[PDB]
Design a protein around this motif. Structure first.
Motif, short mmCIF file in Angstrom:
data_model
loop_
_atom_site.label_atom_id
_atom_site.label_comp_id
_atom_site.label_asym_id
_atom_site.label_seq_id
_atom_site.Cartn_x
_atom_site.Cartn_y
_atom_site.Cartn_z
N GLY A 96 0.79 -1.20 0.00
CA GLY A 96 0.00 0.00 0.00
C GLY A 96 0.83 1.26 0.00
N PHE A 97 1.97 1.27 0.71
CA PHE A 97 2.86 2.45 0.70
C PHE A 97 3.40 2.74 -0.71
N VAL A 98 3.90 1.69 -1.34
CA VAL A 98 4.44 1.72 -2.69
C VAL A 98 3.35 2.11 -3.69
N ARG A 99 2.15 1.57 -3.48
CA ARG A 99 1.01 1.84 -4.38
C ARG A 99 0.68 3.32 -4.46
N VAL A 100 0.75 3.98 -3.31
CA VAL A 100 0.30 5.35 -3.22
C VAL A 100 1.49 6.29 -3.48
N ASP A 101 2.56 6.11 -2.68
CA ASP A 101 3.66 7.04 -2.72
C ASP A 101 4.48 6.86 -3.98
N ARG A 102 4.45 5.68 -4.57
CA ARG A 102 5.14 5.51 -5.86
C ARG A 102 4.19 5.50 -7.04
N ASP A 103 3.33 4.51 -7.14
CA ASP A 103 2.56 4.35 -8.38
C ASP A 103 1.55 5.46 -8.62
N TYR A 104 0.78 5.84 -7.60
CA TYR A 104 -0.26 6.85 -7.81
C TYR A 104 0.34 8.20 -8.05
N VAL A 105 1.47 8.48 -7.40
CA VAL A 105 2.18 9.75 -7.60
C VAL A 105 2.72 9.87 -9.03
N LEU A 106 3.38 8.81 -9.51
CA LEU A 106 3.97 8.80 -10.83
C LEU A 106 2.91 8.89 -11.90
N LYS A 107 1.92 8.03 -11.81
CA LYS A 107 0.82 8.08 -12.77
C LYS A 107 0.19 9.47 -12.84
N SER A 108 0.02 10.08 -11.67
CA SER A 108 -0.52 11.42 -11.58
C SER A 108 0.41 12.44 -12.29
N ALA A 109 1.71 12.31 -12.06
CA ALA A 109 2.70 13.18 -12.70
C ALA A 109 2.76 12.98 -14.20
N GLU A 110 2.69 11.74 -14.65
CA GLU A 110 2.60 11.47 -16.12
C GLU A 110 1.41 12.21 -16.74
N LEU A 111 0.26 12.14 -16.08
CA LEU A 111 -0.94 12.77 -16.60
C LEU A 111 -0.91 14.29 -16.46
N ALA A 112 -0.24 14.82 -15.44
CA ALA A 112 -0.09 16.26 -15.32
C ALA A 112 0.68 16.77 -16.53
N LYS A 113 1.79 16.11 -16.84
CA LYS A 113 2.63 16.52 -17.95
C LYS A 113 1.82 16.44 -19.23
N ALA A 114 1.12 15.33 -19.45
CA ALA A 114 0.30 15.18 -20.68
C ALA A 114 -0.86 16.16 -20.73
N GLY A 115 -1.18 16.81 -19.61
CA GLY A 115 -2.26 17.80 -19.59
C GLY A 115 -1.73 19.22 -19.66
N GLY A 116 -0.46 19.37 -19.99
CA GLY A 116 0.15 20.69 -20.14
C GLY A 116 0.48 21.42 -18.83
N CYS A 117 0.65 20.70 -17.72
CA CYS A 117 1.14 21.30 -16.49
C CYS A 117 2.57 21.77 -16.70
N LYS A 118 2.84 23.02 -16.31
CA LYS A 118 4.12 23.71 -16.63
C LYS A 118 5.12 23.64 -15.47
N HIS A 119 4.60 23.64 -14.25
CA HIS A 119 5.38 23.67 -13.02
C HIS A 119 4.83 22.65 -12.06
N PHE A 120 5.57 21.56 -11.87
CA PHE A 120 5.12 20.48 -11.00
C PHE A 120 5.98 20.63 -9.75
N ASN A 121 5.34 20.47 -8.60
CA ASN A 121 5.96 20.59 -7.31
C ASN A 121 5.77 19.27 -6.54
N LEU A 122 6.86 18.60 -6.20
CA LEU A 122 6.82 17.28 -5.56
C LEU A 122 7.31 17.38 -4.14
#
Length: 209
Positions: A96-122
């Motif tokens: 569950g830690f890996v699922r959220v802190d790794r997979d959901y975060v990354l997937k979310s970041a992939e989609l931010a980029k594909a949605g034209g997000c200019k400044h991502f803050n992690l």
């Protein structure tokens, strides 16, 4: 370049750009103070929460209720934002830690980029290191690298130490409110390059009230 106490002037400059923001993890300890401050400072024209449930409460805020196991179904949620803040964290056990802190975060970041997000803050963590034998520091290290590979126009990585609600003290802990202030002060300031990495010490300096 490195402005002093011209931060209110830079906040006003930022406001006049009329930007939109999304936030992941707004229900979490940093997320909620980030949200409070974003609204109080009135820095953006639109604010959007992306999460798994509608949060109740401040009454002009889009909420996109998404299913993180099917996040592509919800790609539109990530479209049209200028700025993104990912404060997702997990309690949950190892998988569950890996699922959220790794997979959901990354997937979310992939989609931010594909949605034209200019400044991502992690929101990462002191000690992140993909080669760590601590699962925690491992996932942080791994997500940082992968998020850096998305090549956002600007990426800001924050590695606070212990979150409170070189010298030992410069690295060890930081108040949540100070992390939030650091993030938003960094936001209105000129980029130090495509990737910006702020350790606890730097967060303490930039987030001073």
């Amino acid at each position: 370049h490195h402005h002093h106490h011209h931060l209110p002037k830079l906040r006003e400059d930022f406001k006049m750009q009329n930007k939109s923001v999304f936030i992941l993890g707004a229900s979490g300890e940093t997320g909620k103070v980030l949200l409070k401050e974003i609204l109080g400072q009135n820095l953006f024209s639109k604010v959007t929460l992306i999460g798994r449930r509608k949060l109740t409460f401040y009454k002009n805020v889009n909420q996109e209720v998404v299913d993180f196991e099917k996040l592509d179904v919800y790609a539109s949620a990530f479209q049209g934002h200028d700025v993104g803040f990912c404060c997702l964290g997990t309690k949950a056990g190892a998988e569950g830690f890996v699922r959220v802190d790794r997979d959901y975060v990354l997937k979310s970041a992939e989609l931010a980029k594909a949605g034209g997000c200019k400044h991502f803050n992690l929101l990462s963590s002191r000690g992140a290191d993909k080669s760590s034998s601590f699962l925690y520091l491992q996932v942080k290290g791994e997500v940082e690298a992968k998020v850096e590979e998305l090549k956002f126009d600007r990426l800001s990585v924050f590695r606070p130490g212990v979150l409170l609600c070189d010298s030992w003290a410069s690295g060890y802990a930081v108040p949540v409110v100070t992390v939030v202030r650091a993030m938003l002060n960094n936001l209105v300031s000129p980029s130090s390059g495509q990737m910006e990495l702020l350790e606890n010490k730097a967060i303490l300096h930039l987030g001073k009230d």
